[PDB]
Amino acid sequence: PLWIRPDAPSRCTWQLGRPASESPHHHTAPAKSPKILPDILKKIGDTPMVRINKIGKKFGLKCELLAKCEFFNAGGSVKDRISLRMIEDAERDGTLKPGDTIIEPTSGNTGIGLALAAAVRGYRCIIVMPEKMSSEKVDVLRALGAEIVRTPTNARFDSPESHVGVAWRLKNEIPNSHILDQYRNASNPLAHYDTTADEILQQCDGKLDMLVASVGTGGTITGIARKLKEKCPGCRIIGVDPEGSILAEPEELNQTEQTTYEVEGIGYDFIPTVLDRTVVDKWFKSNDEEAFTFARMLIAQEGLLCGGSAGSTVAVAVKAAQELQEGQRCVVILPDSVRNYMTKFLSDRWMLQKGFLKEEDLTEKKPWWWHLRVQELGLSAPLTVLPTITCGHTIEILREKGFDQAPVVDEAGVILGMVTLGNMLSSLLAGKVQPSDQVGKVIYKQFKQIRLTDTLGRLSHILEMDHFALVVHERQMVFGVVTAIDLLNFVAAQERDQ
Amino acid sequence: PLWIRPDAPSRCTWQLGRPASESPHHHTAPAKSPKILPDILKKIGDTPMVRINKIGKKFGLKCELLAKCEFFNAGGSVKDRISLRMIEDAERDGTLKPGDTIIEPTSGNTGIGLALAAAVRGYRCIIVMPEKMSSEKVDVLRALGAEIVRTPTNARFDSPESHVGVAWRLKNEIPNSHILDQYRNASNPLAHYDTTADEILQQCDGKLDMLVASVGTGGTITGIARKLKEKCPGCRIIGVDPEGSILAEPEELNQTEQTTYEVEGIGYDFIPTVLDRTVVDKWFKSNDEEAFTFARMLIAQEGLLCGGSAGSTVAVAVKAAQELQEGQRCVVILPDSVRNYMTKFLSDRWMLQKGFLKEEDLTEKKPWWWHLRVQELGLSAPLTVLPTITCGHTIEILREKGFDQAPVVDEAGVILGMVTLGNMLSSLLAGKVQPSDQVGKVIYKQFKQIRLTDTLGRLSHILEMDHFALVVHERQMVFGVVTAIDLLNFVAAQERDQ
Ligand code: HEM
Numbered sequence: 001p002l003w004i005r006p007d008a009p010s011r012c013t014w015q016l017g018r019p020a021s022e023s024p025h026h027h028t029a030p031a032k033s034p035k036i037l038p039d040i041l042k043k044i045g046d047t048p049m050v051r052i053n054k055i056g057k058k059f060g061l062k063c064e065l066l067a068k069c070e071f072f073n074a075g076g077s078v079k080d081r082i083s084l085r086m087i088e089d090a091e092r093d094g095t096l097k098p099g100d101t102i103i104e105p106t107s108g109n110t111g112i113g114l115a116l117a118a119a120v121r122g123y124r125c126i127i128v129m130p131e132k133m134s135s136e137k138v139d140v141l142r143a144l145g146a147e148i149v150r151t152p153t154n155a156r157f158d159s160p161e162s163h164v165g166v167a168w169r170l171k172n173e174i175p176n177s178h179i180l181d182q183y184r185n186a187s188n189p190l191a192h193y194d195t196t197a198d199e200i201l202q203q204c205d206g207k208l209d210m211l212v213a214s215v216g217t218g219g220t221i222t223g224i225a226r227k228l229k230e231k232c233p234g235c236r237i238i239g240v241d242p243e244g245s246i247l248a249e250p251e252e253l254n255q256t257e258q259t260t261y262e263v264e265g266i267g268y269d270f271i272p273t274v275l276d277r278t279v280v281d282k283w284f285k286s287n288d289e290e291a292f293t294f295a296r297m298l299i300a301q302e303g304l305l306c307g308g309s310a311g312s313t314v315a316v317a318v319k320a321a322q323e324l325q326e327g328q329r330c331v332v333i334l335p336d337s338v339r340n341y342m343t344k345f346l347s348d349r350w351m352l353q354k355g356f357l358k359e360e361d362l363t364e365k366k367p368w369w370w371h372l373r374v375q376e377l378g379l380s381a382p383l384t385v386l387p388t389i390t391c392g393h394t395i396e397i398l399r400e401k402g403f404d405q406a407p408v409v410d411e412a413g414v415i416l417g418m419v420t421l422g423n424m425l426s427s428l429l430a431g432k433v434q435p436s437d438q439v440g441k442v443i444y445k446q447f448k449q450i451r452l453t454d455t456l457g458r459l460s461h462i463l464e465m466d467h468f469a470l471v472v473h474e475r476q477m478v479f480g481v482v483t484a485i486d487l488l489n490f491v492a493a494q495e496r497d498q
Numbered sequence: 499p500l501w502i503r504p505d506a507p508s509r510c511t512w513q514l515g516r517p518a519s520e521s522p523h524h525h526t527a528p529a530k531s532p533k534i535l536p537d538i539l540k541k542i543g544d545t546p547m548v549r550i551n552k553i554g555k556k557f558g559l560k561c562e563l564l565a566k567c568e569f570f571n572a573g574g575s576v577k578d579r580i581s582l583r584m585i586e587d588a589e590r591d592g593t594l595k596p597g598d599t600i601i602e603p604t605s606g607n608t609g610i611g612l613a614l615a616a617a618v619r620g621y622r623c624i625i626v627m628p629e630k631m632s633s634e635k636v637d638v639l640r641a642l643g644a645e646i647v648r649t650p651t652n653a654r655f656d657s658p659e660s661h662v663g664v665a666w667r668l669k670n671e672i673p674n675s676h677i678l679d680q681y682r683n684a685s686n687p688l689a690h691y692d693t694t695a696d697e698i699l700q701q702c703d704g705k706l707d708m709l710v711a712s713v714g715t716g717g718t719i720t721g722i723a724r725k726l727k728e729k730c731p732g733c734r735i736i737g738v739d740p741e742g743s744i745l746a747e748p749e750e751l752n753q754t755e756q757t758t759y760e761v762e763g764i765g766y767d768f769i770p771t772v773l774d775r776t777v778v779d780k781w782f783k784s785n786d787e788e789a790f791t792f793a794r795m796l797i798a799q800e801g802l803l804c805g806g807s808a809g810s811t812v813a814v815a816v817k818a819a820q821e822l823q824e825g826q827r828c829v830v831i832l833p834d835s836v837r838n839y840m841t842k843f844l845s846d847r848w849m850l851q852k853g854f855l856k857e858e859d860l861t862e863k864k865p866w867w868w869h870l871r872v873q874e875l876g877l878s879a880p881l882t883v884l885p886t887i888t889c890g891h892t893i894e895i896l897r898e899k900g901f902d903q904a905p906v907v908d909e910a911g912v913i914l915g916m917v918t919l920g921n922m923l924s925s926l927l928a929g930k931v932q933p934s935d936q937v938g939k940v941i942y943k944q945f946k947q948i949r950l951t952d953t954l955g956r957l958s959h960i961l962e963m964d965h966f967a968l969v970v971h972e973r974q975m976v977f978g979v980v981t982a983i984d985l986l987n988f989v990a991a992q993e994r995d996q
């Protein structure tokens with residue numbers, strides 16, 4: 001029966017204070033990045049340590065708050081590291097032959113790093129990930145050439161349908177295939193122990209008072225915390241676990257209602273082999289709301305384009321470093337980029353749909369003019385023209401009636417678009433078009449519709465995807481054409497009273 | 499009348515051979531990146547020079563093909579550079595006060611860099627971009643806190659509705675607002691002349707035989723080509739223009755049918771001030787197909803996650819460096835990341851929808867088993883259960899009938915999902931659930947449907963978004979449940995004949 005248990009307790013005999021000389025493992029030092037990178041894989045590591053200027057103090061931190069930004073790696077996640085190490089170690093092992101197939105269960109970042117490295121190094125790749133993870137990860141993977149298999153999100157790691165189970169079943173059916181097994185592989189936390197912690201230590205010049213990291217496989221926090229407990233004994237290690245996962249200690253903290261959560265990449269229903277919970281000094285629970293709030297905040301305030309787990313981490317950090325005082329510094333790990341989450345926590349519609357943003361929370365911060373009917377804009381019914389009308393003729397019409405723009409509406413009363421006087425003239429002067437040509441040749445095709453009873457805020461959101469907003473009867477009937485500028489002119493006029 | 503013409507010829511008096519001492523402009527040297535970055539903006543520049551190993555030789559290049567990967571910048575595009583420079587110069591100018599509003603017309607990358615820098619440095623930001631650009635750019639921008647206005651893509655730069663026009667109209671209506679004007683600003687090509695070209699020169703140790711870049715505002719190719727013609731006179735400069743734009747020389751090359759194209763960020767209906775076409779040694783036309791092909795190829799082969807303009811560039815480069823021979827090297831500029839294009843050229847559905855991929859081109863590379871009806875899988879009609887059934891009871895049923903899994907179908911014949919024997923047992927042993935509990939507590943909710951007449955390839959694509967594929971009558975009737983593994987077992991059996 002070959003399925004190796006991912007939650008198997010660690011056989012590692014490391015304990016704080018064992019001389020490094022005693023370690024069986026193969027260790028690699030970070031190497032200086034060259035002038036010319038010979039391949040893309042060398043762009044992994046040497047990530048920037050960027051300071052958190054605003055978010056720290058907004059919450060009243062007396063300390064220095066640092067972020068190790070790992071989304072600057074080639075694959076765009078902290079997983080690219082282990083992804084390299086694993087494969088490289090698997091080549092020195094002689095276990096991984098050229099042309100072999102690599103199969104991995106993953107949150108999907110590890111999958112990205114691996115499929116990438118495969119694309120470069122000529123390995124076939126098969127990634128198994130939960131149904132929960134974002135479609136962006138899928139798009140990137142399929143672009144890298146990796147075959148993709150999905151597993152239910154409700155599956156237990158014990159059950160055959162889980163990503164671990166499906167990975168193994170695939171290994172057993174496929175020749176020359178290996179499972180690099182990020183949960184049990186020593187290469188994973190060794191990646192962080194050898195490089196990431198060396199980096200964090202060098203960048204901080206040895207002075208470090210706290211570290212905070214979200215816990216996945218547990219490789220990051222483990223690998224870091226071991227080298228930290230060795231080289232920086234004073235440093236406290238703080239873990240972040242989502243509600244619904246079991247990772248945190250003590251167990252009391254795990255008692256909760258939801259078994260599912262929206263944050264991708266962190267937390268599990270089992271304790272992975274590579275996770276050493278003994279090196280973690282304190283655990284904190286984060287939830288989905290805290291996560292996305294603080295992620296959005298990282299973006300808007302610090303200008304770090306990063307994913308949700310990062311939000312969980314920082315949300316925890318501002319609570320955890322409160323005990324710190326001036327002169328101390330706290331490093332926080334930011335795992336991956338916004339690239340994965342584009343249609344999820346980055347999109348307001350999804351945030352509403354999943355109920356993290358209440359419409360109230362939005363509306364309170366919004367201006368006076370936000371809740372107002374569009375009718376109050378002073379719209380004027382525009383002249384309409386047929387698509388089959390002739391250009392110069394339309395100019396004659398627009399000038400003769402004194403109109404600057406017209407919606408082009410079909411014979412059937414279907415609005416096809418817009419033509420503007422300006423674009424017409426400019427197009428003519430240039431000889432791009434003739435006075436005898438169809439007006440369709442110059443029509444701006446794209447627009448959006450609204451009721452006279454819609455809120456101006458609605459208009460705002462629309463005006464972010466379109467230039468023209470046609471207020472329409474519930475028709476061939478256009479009560480008005482509203483652009484962004486017109487809304488401006490409205491508000492600015494309402495200003496010159498006070 | 500304040501609208502400054504973007505296509506205004508350059509007032510720059512530089513000509514090759516003027517001593518740099520004579521230059522009026524303020525020049526900045528690239529600075530060594532610190533241990534701790536004090537803010538994120540310091541992550542701009544020092545981009546990697548990564549070699550192209552496969553794509554070069556596949557097309558028979560005898561030369562060394564290098565890529566300057568600019569998507570590693572903080573905002574994820576080459577625009578972050580000018581975005582910094584512009585703002586920084588605007589602060590030394592004393593023109594930009596704290597709290598001022600910055601308004602920019604843009605392809606959207608410049609907008610991202612600018613809005614980012616605004617988020618960091620406390621400037622209000624308003625970005626005007628065409629309706630054509632991708633919604634991802636919008637999502638990122640809105641996340642950074644920038645207000646967004648869109649303009650028709652058919653608008654001429656002369657007409658008031660163009661992004662340039664709308665930008666200016668906004669400057670004129672808004673107090674404390676400035677237009678940094680990437681088309682006319684010297685800060686833009688000076689950014690590349692001062693840093694990017696210094697970088698390219700250092701990384702290549704002075705030996706460079708060719709440079710290829712796509713042309714936007716023209717800042718990149720200009721700024722680079724000037725310092726190149728000064729410091730590396732032998733180097734040929736090659737520009738890339740999309741079909742439908744006017745940028746290329748001589749004019750004969752521009753004669754074309756389409757006025758529109760899908761590639762974002764490059765090409766224009768006018769020649770920007772900052773573009774110096776005299777330093778460009780030869781021009782090449784690229785189109786949409788070449789672009790997306792080669793972009794996808796960059797990803798799949800070289801593992802560079804990058805956008806379309808990059809594809810145009812490389813597609814040109816493999817044609818242009820053919821004249822080169824062994825021992826020479828050619829640098830190619832890769833502007834931005836895949837982040838922007840996720841739902842466009844990265845998604846196969848969009849590639850089909852826009853007709854760049856013909857279904858034939860796909861099907862030819864696909865295996866023997868690709869065109870086969872799903873019926874040929876040997877499906878077995880599964881036992882169905884009600885959502886209201888009890889857990890232990892379902893176990894009794896599944897074991898008693900020898901079935902391992904059942905679709906959970908509603909009383910109304912609506913399929914709600916799946917329960918598997920394994921997940922049931924594992925859940926019970928763990929005490930997560932009781933024998934008396936509703937089966938709904940453990941249902942895998944997500945699946946997809948197919949006809950018995952569907953192609954196995956269809957099944958493949960589906961099996962990338964879902965674990966379960968339920969083949970269904972056109973109903974309460976499930977002819978079978980197909981997972982990825984089952985398709986594997988099918989094919990692998992069809993293998994053991996030969
Ligand atoms: C003096 C230091 C260390 C010693 C003596 C040591 C020793 C060992 C040994 C002997 C094993 C294999 C047990 C077996 O399979 O029979 C092992 C496994 C492992 N080691 Fe270490 N180790 C050290 C440090 C580390 C560090 C710093 C890390 C990473 C943070 C690490 C990661 C692992 C992992 C993930 C395993 C796999 C556990 C398993 O296969 O069940 N080791 N270690």
Ligand code: HEM
Pocket residue numbers: 506507508509510511512513516517518519520521522523682683684685687688691720721724771772
């Ligand atoms: C010895 C070298 C150079 C000299 C003497 C020089 C001179 C000038 C002068 C005098 C102007 C302003 C004309 C006016 O507004 O009255 C100008 C504008 C400008 N310069 Fe240079 N320049 C040099 C190099 C460069 C380089 C290397 C770049 C960037 C690649 C550059 C970029 C620009 C740009 C974009 C303008 C704006 C043109 C306009 O406002 O219409 N200059 N230059």
Ligand SMILES: *Cc1c(COP(=O)(O)O)cnc(C)c1O
Pocket residue numbers: 077078079107108109110214215216217218219220221264265266307309310335336
């Ligand atoms: C894997 C991952 C983590 C967790 O890192 P571990 O080393 O597994 O603890 C956090 N966030 C994201 C996005 C991840 O992919």
Ligand SMILES: *Cc1c(COP(=O)(O)O)cnc(C)c1O
Pocket residue numbers: 575576577605606607608712713714715716717718719762763764805807808833834
């Ligand atoms: C701006 C841009 C370019 C062109 O660079 P220029 O310096 O304007 O010539 C190419 N690709 C993308 C994605 C861009 O945003």
